[PDB]
Design a protein around this ligand. Sequence first.
Ligand SMILES: CN[C@H]1CC[C@@H](c2ccc(Cl)c(Cl)c2)c2ccccc21
Ligand SMILES: CN[C@H]1CC[C@@H](c2ccc(Cl)c(Cl)c2)c2ccccc21
Ligand SMILES: CN[C@H]1CC[C@@H](c2ccc(Cl)c(Cl)c2)c2ccccc21
Lengths: 176, 173, 174
Amino acid sequence: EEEERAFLVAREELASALRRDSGQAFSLEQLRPLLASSLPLAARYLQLDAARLVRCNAHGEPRNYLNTLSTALNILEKYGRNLLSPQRPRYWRGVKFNNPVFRSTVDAVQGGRDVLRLYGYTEEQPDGLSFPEGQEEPDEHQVATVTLEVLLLRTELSLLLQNTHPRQQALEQLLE
Amino acid sequence: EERAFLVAREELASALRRDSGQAFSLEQLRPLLASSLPLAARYLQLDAARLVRCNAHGEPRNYLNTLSTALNILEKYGRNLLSPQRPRYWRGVKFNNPVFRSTVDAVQGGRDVLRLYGYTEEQPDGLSFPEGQEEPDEHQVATVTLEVLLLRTELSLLLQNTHPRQQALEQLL
Amino acid sequence: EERAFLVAREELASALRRDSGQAFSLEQLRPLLASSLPLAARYLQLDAARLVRCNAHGEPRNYLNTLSTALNILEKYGRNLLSPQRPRYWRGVKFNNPVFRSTVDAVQGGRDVLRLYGYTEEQPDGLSFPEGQEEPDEHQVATVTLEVLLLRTELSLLLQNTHPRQQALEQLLE
Ligand SMILES: CN[C@H]1CC[C@@H](c2ccc(Cl)c(Cl)c2)c2ccccc21
Ligand SMILES: CN[C@H]1CC[C@@H](c2ccc(Cl)c(Cl)c2)c2ccccc21
Ligand SMILES: CN[C@H]1CC[C@@H](c2ccc(Cl)c(Cl)c2)c2ccccc21
């Protein structure tokens, strides 16, 4: 009740801060209503399939695949931040799979391509994904909400790698 | 070798349409098992790469058996759609089924295999065919059924240590 | 035959107490396999009738595999509870563990086996030990682990058609 109410408030608040300033940095205190929340994962991540991304990429030592997942999420977070900035990139409506950074980070994670579809890159192409022909501008509320969930999962994976997660003992039971 | 593999694909797929309850031997699947082609060339509809990657948790003797059991149930669903007397409830699959929730729904991506059969419409209690579709896609159902049968056979051969490429497959886990 | 069954029962239950990783052979469990004693006397803690009856749905080649794999993971939980180098989080089990959903939670009554191990208190996301309890009942854990080991072996031998009472047990699944 009281904890579930502060979660939806912080989610809508931080999503607008990304729309107001796409380059805004968030501290661990600003995201604490979303990290320390004892809400189930289905209620915490409404768009980003956090359960899938963790399940399909938990291979090897946790010191490595949590690091590989966090790096791919940092790249995916930059894609959503670029869409929300007033000075959008010249090729904002098209991501190519053969990018050297993309192939070494996002394409190295099972399900990283599907995260781009959440931003709006829904049209499949033999070299990448693209925004649909006709969509003049991206849905800011959709991009900001997905960017916040991507940034939140990256923060959650980062907190686990430093043994500083609020539910560190609980999350480690799902990997051992 | 890509031509010989594609010829045996249409051969077994046409055999499933002829008799949906026809049992295949290891020799009949030999041109598909012993093969040097990549996985993307051997599995066109079934995403065998993610089906193993998203479910290779724990001991291999455990999750390979769970994967093959779920594929055995998914194979029966495709064979039922190719039967001359289809089940009376072939148009939909319920998530709350005791057999379904214990085998297919226990595997990440098992519902995606049902979508390949034709169960594309999502409902709160399961998946169903589009209401405007009279009959299932026999060519598509037979193709997915054969690939599901092949993946389950490959997982089974790994557990018996009789896979033709057993050594190479074990290094991928 | 009841005294002979209990004689080898504590012999295997004590072997798991000293060495939890010590694997048992078929000849070691055969005295407990070919016994014509009723199931009520062979399983005192594990509800073997519940696990088989409530999950014998579909083809026997399918649910016997699902039952065997779930018990193999349940046997790993009991063995780790008796290990001298216990895991750091032996006091709790999460339902959303990717191995748990595909094996134990896929079987009707699998969570009750964890309660026999000691995981009696329930959380919205799993089961855990009571806060007052600091060490598990090594006698009860080894007793349940042995019976879980017993049921897994019985289901595995039936799938291989090498069970000592194969024809008798097959008549209970028609
Ligand atoms: C169904 N989702 C599961 C698996 C993901 C798993 C999870 C979620 C986030 C992270 Cl960062 C990790 Cl390591 C693991 C989890 C956590 C709490 C409740 C449920 C779940
Ligand atoms: C990209 N696909 C990979 C992973 C699956 C992996 C594979 C395929 C079938 C099985 Cl039964 C297993 Cl255990 C593992 C494989 C095999 C041959 C060529 C490629 C691949
Ligand atoms: C009513 N008691 C039943 C339980 C299940 C049944 C049983 C027990 C173990 C297994 Cl492996 C199977 Cl297939 C079936 C049985 C067997 C012998 C004596 C009694 C019983």
